[PDB]
Ligand binder design. Structure first.
Ligand code: HEC
Ligand code: HEC
Lengths: 76, 76
């Protein structure tokens, strides 16, 4: 594979300029628009990945309830 | 509290404050001390994962040569 092609499909997700930051734990105001999407939508996004969040959120054995509880914890 | 143990196992890696940034593509000065470790050592680190980088760097089909080429591409 071409170095730039590997970069353009995978490594750029985190190694490019202008990567979107994660909503930080206990930043209630940043979490409000996320929580408004609904917990089921947010849990699905953790499982499928988004931007610099890899699919599964680095939690190999997380249940849906584990993901929901972690989101609730971070949101306040 | 519900969610804190999951957060402390997984989500804090990116959702806490003070997370180490990725060395950015074409940031030659950031890459210099990494390249000095040896390209093979950097390839092994991508495969193992490190901080907010998951094992494999989100490349499933990358040979060691594919990883080396991607690192060279980012390094200048
Ligand atoms: C976000 C989910 C990432 C993807 C996709 C890739 N990388 Fe990454 N990388 C990332 C972070 C946050 C860091 C810094 C880690 C730390 O805590 O220091 C890195 C670092 C590297 C390094 C340097 C390793 C070192 O010992 O200094 C290399 C060589 C590296 N990353 C290569 C790499 C390649 C080739 C990827 C695409 C296949 C790739 N990374 C994806 C975050 C992320
Ligand atoms: C870095 C490797 C991450 C880990 C581990 C987890 N998350 Fe994450 N998350 C991260 C980033 C960079 C972002 C922003 C994505 C973007 O581009 O918008 C996020 C975002 C979330 C979201 C919000 C999704 C949305 O559509 O706005 C949620 C609900 C989320 N993250 C939850 C979550 C949980 C529960 C994790 C532990 C199991 C977790 N994340 C880990 C980066 C990373």
């Amino acid at each position: 594979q071409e170095g730039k092609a590997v970069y353009d499909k995978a490594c750029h997700i985190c190694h490019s300029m202008g990567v979107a930051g994660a909503p930080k734990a206990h930043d209630a105001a940043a979490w409000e628009p996320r929580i408004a999407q609904g917990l089921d939508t947010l849990v699905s996004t953790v499982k499928t990945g988004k931007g610099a969040m890899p699919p599964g959120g680095m939690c190999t054995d997380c249940t849906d309830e584990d993901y929901k509880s972690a989101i609730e914890y971070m949101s306040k």
